[PDB]
Amino acid sequence: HHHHHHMVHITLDRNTANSWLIISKDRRQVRMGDTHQNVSDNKERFSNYPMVLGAQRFSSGKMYWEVDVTQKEAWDLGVCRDSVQRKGQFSLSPENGFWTIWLWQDSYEAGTSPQTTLHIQVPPCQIGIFVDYEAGVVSFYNITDHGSLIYTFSECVFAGPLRPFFNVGFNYSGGNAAPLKLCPL
Numbered sequence: 001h002h003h004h005h006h007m008v009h010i011t012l013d014r015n016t017a018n019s020w021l022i023i024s025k026d027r028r029q030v031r032m033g034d035t036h037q038n039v040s041d042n043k044e045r046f047s048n049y050p051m052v053l054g055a056q057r058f059s060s061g062k063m064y065w066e067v068d069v070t071q072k073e074a075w076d077l078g079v080c081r082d083s084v085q086r087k088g089q090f091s092l093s094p095e096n097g098f099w100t101i102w103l104w105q106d107s108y109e110a111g112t113s114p115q116t117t118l119h120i121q122v123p124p125c126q127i128g129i130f131v132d133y134e135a136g137v138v139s140f141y142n143i144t145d146h147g148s149l150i151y152t153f154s155e156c157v158f159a160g161p162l163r164p165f166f167n168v169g170f171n172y173s174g175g176n177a178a179p180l181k182l183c184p185l
């Protein structure tokens, strides 16, 4: 792909984080802590899952960023509406305002409803995410495999401002403690 020139500097919004997450001082990395991180509750925090939003809001244009997923067993990545549900249980779908892919139990899937099997020959260590607001497109690229396409959501109905979306995943296994990291431009 040739989307690198639309690179944007993403930072994480502490106020949206699940209360177990630890966001680095530079707001570029997030991981699951082993307990509640001693923050007050607020209506923005994702309550049921280890999720956090980027601070940036996008309502036009073309945007590109990259996320490091090295040695993780489970994660979700993409974009979502600013108005997505924060509390209780919900599925990651375009109907609920999410355009995402994930790794779960040794398979990669796109967050359609129902979910779509992805075909990845080279497990990615970094993911590129491209949003074209006007065109209604969200695309995912395998940076480890020379930028190969993973998945394109087209005919997207964003229906609001978009935020970068992250899920570090649970760590029931003891094998998923590693952080998500926003990679430098």
Ligand SMILES: CC#CCN(C)C1CCS(=O)(=O)CC1
Pocket: 049, 050, 075, 076, 092, 102, 103, 104, 167, 169, 170
């Ligand atoms: C099937 C599947 C999948 C991957 N995610 C959509 C979930 C999000 C909720 S969760 O509790 O973080 C488990 C992982």
Ligand SMILES: CC#CCN(C)C1CCS(=O)(=O)CC1
Pocket: 018, 020, 034, 047, 048, 049, 050, 169, 170, 171, 172
């Ligand atoms: C956020 C949240 C939650 C659910 N928890 C009580 C734990 C979090 C740490 S764990 O290792 O994922 C086991 C499940």
